[PDB]
Ligand SMILES: CC(C)=CCC/C(C)=C\CSP(=O)(O)OP(=O)(O)O
């Protein structure tokens with residue numbers, strides 16, 4: 001119903017409040033094809049401090065209704081919101097669906113630039129080596145031993161970023177080392193990424209998902225991401241947050257009195273790009289639990 005319009009209104013108010021580059025011409029075209037999937041599925045609105053003074057704004061949804069799997073890529077292609085510009089990421093979603101059983105779908109949207117990402121989550125966990133036969137970046141295969149050595153072993157999902165022509169591999173935290181802070185300090189050190197704070201190293205002991213980004217332009221792992229859920233606003237560690245992101249924890253729209261959040265900590269090479277914070281609000285309240 002109006003549920004689509006509440007959502008669209010909320011995104012626009014979020015961008016305007018937090019200084020995110022946005023286009024309504026682009027938001028309209030997205031909502032024409034997808035607005036109903038935002039009302040009917042697990043749905044989150046994200047901001048990130050990729051720049052210190054201005055948050056960018058994204059909105060995402062996951063489809064887990066089995067009968068609807070693949071519909072998102074079909075309607076993104078058919079609608080024209082995702083074109084096939086020949087780039088190496090353009091074949092990845094078709095390759096994934098032939099190789100693995102798919103259990104959930106998702107697409108990510110940039111509020112200025114439109115459709116940014118497509119997700120596929122495997123039916124179950126697979127050894128990351130099973131992915132090596134895809135046209136993934138060469139940096140996945142060349143890092144097979146690193147992956148094994150840090151138990152980034154258990155692949156469960158893909159993100160295909162058509163904006164940055166990169167690939168996120170998502171790993172389940174199966175190993176007892178994945179619940180010790182020392183592991184995350186040593187992983188980040190082995191990558192020569194920005195070391196994390198002590199507050200975050202303690203929180204990371206409860207960590208749930210680890211993601212790594214590969215791109216076709218680089219022989220290097222580009223960045224990694226840790227993710228943690230938080231049951232409501234006040235559960236979120238205020239001290240690890242940009243005053244703009246503290247604000248977002250307090251004002252972010254939801255269709256529920258006190259929504260949960262997923263936070264993401266992206267780390268990149270020390271002294272470079274890729275080390276910032278992502279804040280997703282559980283807009284229906286039915287995703288973090
Ligand atoms: C829509 C759902 C269920 C989850 C989306 C948010 C989440 C916790 C993880 C995947 S989004 P992410 O990999 O963090 O995107 P990038 O930072 O790689 O651009």
Ligand SMILES: [Mg+2]
Nearest residue numbers: 041063064065
């Ligand atoms: Mg659904």
